[PDB]
Design a binder for these strands. Structure first.
Length: 58
RNA sequence: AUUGGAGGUAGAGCACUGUUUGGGUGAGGGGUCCGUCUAGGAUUACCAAUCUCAGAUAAACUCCGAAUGCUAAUACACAU
């Protein structure tokens, strides 16, 4: 499963344990779809951070 | 993200320290009279000496015991 990564919310107004995670995925402005790394357990990014990104199978 | 530990916090029940509701349990301590060789046997009365059974009760209760988080290694992702 190879998944690209989207956005639904600005990072303003959340935990820095969300800020640095979005930073770790490295998107910058919104919905710059980082077409990368659908390997699991950094699916913990897409699932711990699941309030934020549509799972888009790249 | 997984594994590894650690912490007793919240919660709870009471396992101890505290407080406490009943019910049972009882010397005794104050009410007949026999009665001050003579003490008493007493009547019931408040607690009934504990303990027993349910009922709780808490920051300085904890036989327990989280979820969270913190840390170690590993994994993957990055760039510090």
């Amino acid at each position: 499963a190879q998944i690209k990564i989207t956005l639904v919310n600005s990072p303003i107004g959340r935990i820095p344990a969300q800020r640095k995670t979005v930073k770790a995925l490295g998107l910058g402005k919104l919905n710059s779809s980082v077409v990368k790394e659908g390997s699991p357990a950094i699916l913990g990014m897409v699932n711990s951070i699941s309030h934020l990104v549509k799972v888009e199978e790249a």
